[PDB]
Amino acid sequence: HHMSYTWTGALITPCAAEESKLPINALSNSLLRHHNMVYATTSRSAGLRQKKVTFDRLQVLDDHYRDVLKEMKAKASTVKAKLLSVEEACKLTPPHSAKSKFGYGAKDVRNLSSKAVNHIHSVWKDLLEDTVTPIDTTIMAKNEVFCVQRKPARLIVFPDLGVRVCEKMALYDVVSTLPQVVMGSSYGFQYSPGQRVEFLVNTWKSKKNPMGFSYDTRCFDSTVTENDIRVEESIYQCCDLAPEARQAIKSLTERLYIGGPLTNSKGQNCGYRRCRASGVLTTSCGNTLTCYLKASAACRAAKLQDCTMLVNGDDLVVICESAGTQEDAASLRVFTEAMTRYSAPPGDPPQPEYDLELITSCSSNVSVAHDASGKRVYYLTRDPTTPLARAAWETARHTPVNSWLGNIIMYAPTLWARMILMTHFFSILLAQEQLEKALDCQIYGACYSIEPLDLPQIIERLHGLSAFSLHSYSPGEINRVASCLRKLGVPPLRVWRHRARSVRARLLSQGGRAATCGKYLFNWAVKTKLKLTPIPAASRLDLSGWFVAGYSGGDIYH
Numbered sequence: 166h167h168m169s170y171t172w173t174g175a176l177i178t179p180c181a182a183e184e185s186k187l188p189i190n191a192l193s194n195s196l197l198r199h200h201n202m203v204y205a206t207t208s209r210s211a212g213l214r215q216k217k218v219t220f221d222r223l224q225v226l227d228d229h230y231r232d233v234l235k236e237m238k239a240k241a242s243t244v245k246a247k248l249l250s251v252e253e254a255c256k257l258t259p260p261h262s263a264k265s266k267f268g269y270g271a272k273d274v275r276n277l278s279s280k281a282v283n284h285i286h287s288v289w290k291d292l293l294e295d296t297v298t299p300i301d302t303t304i305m306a307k308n309e310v311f312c313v314q315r316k317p318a319r320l321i322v323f324p325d326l327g328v329r330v331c332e333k334m335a336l337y338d339v340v341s342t343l344p345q346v347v348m349g350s351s352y353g354f355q356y357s358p359g360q361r362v363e364f365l366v367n368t369w370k371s372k373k374n375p376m377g378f379s380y381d382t383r384c385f386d387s388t389v390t391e392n393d394i395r396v397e398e399s400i401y402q403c404c405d406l407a408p409e410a411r412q413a414i415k416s417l418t419e420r421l422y423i424g425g426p427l428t429n430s431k432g433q434n435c436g437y438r439r440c441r442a443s444g445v446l447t448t449s450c451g452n453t454l455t456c457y458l459k460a461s462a463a464c465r466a467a468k469l470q471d472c473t474m475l476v477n478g479d480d481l482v483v484i485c486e487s488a489g490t491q492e493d494a495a496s497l498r499v500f501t502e503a504m505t506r507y508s509a510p511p512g513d514p515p516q517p518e519y520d521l522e523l524i525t526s527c528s529s530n531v532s533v534a535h536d537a538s539g540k541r542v543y544y545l546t547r548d549p550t551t552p553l554a555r556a557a558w559e560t561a562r563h564t565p566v567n568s569w570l571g572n573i574i575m576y577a578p579t580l581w582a583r584m585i586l587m588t589h590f591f592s593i594l595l596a597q598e599q600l601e602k603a604l605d606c607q608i609y610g611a612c613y614s615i616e617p618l619d620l621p622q623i624i625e626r627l628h629g630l631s632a633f634s635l636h637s638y639s640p641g642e643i644n645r646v647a648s649c650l651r652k653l654g655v656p657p658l659r660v661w662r663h664r665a666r667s668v669r670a671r672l673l674s675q676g677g678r679a680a681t682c683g684k685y686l687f688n689w690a691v692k693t694k695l696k697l698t699p700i701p702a703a704s705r706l707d708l709s710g711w712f713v714a715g716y717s718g719g720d721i722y723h
């Protein structure tokens with residue numbers, strides 16, 4: 166058997182006390198009344214996830230697969246990648262990333278303390294000298310917030326801190342550089358949300374009769390086989406690399422990436438992994454390469470015409486030429502059969518779509534609004550259910566990752582981000598005078614320390630000034646927002662408009678950066694608008710590294 170996991174029977178254990186029910190404070194009801202709709206996942210449901218992720222994988226590899234791989238390797242050979250120093254690798258480590266089993270923490274790593282740096286050096290030497298001994302990993306249940314309809318906790322699998330820094334030294338430059346070179350415009354993590362909409366729309370516009378579909382692989386990490394993971398290393402090895410980097414990548418593949426022993430928080434042996442570790446540097450890059458490889462081959466197998474893929478890890482969308490409605494449904498059944506043969510069967514079956522705004526990829530869809538001139542403007546949005554469940558949790562609880570800040574960055578142009586999220590959280594931050602306190606959030610899986618007072622500069626830079634003037638959202642978009650609010654017990658959009666006028670007035674009264682936030686962020690709320698001009702600070706905003714690559718699970722801080 167080629168099983169994704171084997172289990173001893175030891176439980177997946179928490180390392181802290183876990184909350185499942187929505188924490189409520191005095192601010193909760195101003196956002197959300199249906200508190201019972203909102204939950205966090207815990208280790209109590211881990212067993213249910215273990216049944217989902219444990220299965221036998223079969224893989225039949227044909228000539229389309231090897232043809233695509235050979236083309237990918239040829240592009241990969243043009244990549245020259247650098248070895249990071251220990252010091253460079255250390256500054257990429259999140260301030261609150263899990264501490265070592267070996268007497269030092271993430272703060273120690275970032276300060277380049279001699280004890281951390283000495284141990285990292287010893288893990289590095291061990292990797293160069295030993296290419297066989299499985300590396301230990303911890304298995305944990307993630308605590309994640311959702312609206313009902315309950316999901317079981319996702320699992321996270323990660324090596325010790327010293328190993329994680331070693332992954333960066335060996336491979337940070339590779340996973341940041343290689344996928345765009347190999348996949349070109351198909352690599353999703355190179356785009357901002359607006360660069361993504363322009364690619365999707367331009368691609369849709371370059372087909373006589375466009376057809377698109379998203380493809381949902383059931384448990385993508387568990388579908389990743391030893392072959393798949395060895396193929397990724399052969400792709401990494403195509404790069405021009407230093408001899409120490411080649412040996413470290415070989416060693417990390419053999420000892421960590423291919424599989425290893427699973428240990429709970431209590432130190433007990435839980436089992437063994439033979440699939441993708443969800444918490445290593447190469448998770449995002451490995452997943453994107455494996456998904457693009459299999460999908461590219463599956464496109465050729467199905468005889469899909471003029472195929473453009475967009476791939477973000479395990480998230481896949483294809484836009485192609487329609488050969489007619491019946492040949493489309495048929496070609497999708499063959500694409501799906503090919504994918505299955507390659508060990509990537511679907512969860513939901515793929516559906517062909519003939520309207521761009523109806524395809525969901527990366528939990529997002531294109532939509533249309535109008536700028537300050539009446540022009541039709543395409544922008545990225547999503548169903549706000551999960552953004553709003555998480556915002557409710559963050560209303561009453563301090564969390565490591567402020568999802569609301571990251572959702573405002575990613576979805577600033579949206580009706581729901583501007584009306585609810587900006588209104589709610591600027592109002593909370595005004596009341597606490599915490600406007601200039603930097604908060605952690607994540608974009609494409611990497612962690613960023615961000616001042617909420619810098620939001621005007623940031624939004625202009627990523628989305629343009631039009632994000633501050635959009636209006637006349639589509640009916641379907643308005644109805645999905647309004648309907649989500651009713652479900653969660655959120656006050657309707659008229660209440661938020663009334664609240665934003667208050668919040669705006671309050672911000673301008675602070676002067677300076679707060680006034681800029683009031684001026685730019687809430688101009689949609691007043692009838693007598695202000696003159697919104699390019700912000701000098703935005704020009705100078707150092708936004709390098711932001712949408713280059715994906716590092717979900719990769720333990721990255723910028």
Ligand SMILES: C[C@@H]1C[C@H](C)CN(C(=O)c2cc(Br)ccc2NC(=O)CCC(=O)O)C1
Nearest residue numbers: 580583584635636637638643658659662689
């Ligand atoms: C769909 C919302 C319903 C709410 C009651 C009012 N309303 C807004 O205040 C609004 C919010 C943002 Br953010 C941007 C524009 C808004 N107003 C409009 O789109 C009004 C119609 C228009 O200008 O075409 C729109």
Ligand code: NI
Nearest residue numbers: 228229231232
């Ligand atoms: Ni061939």
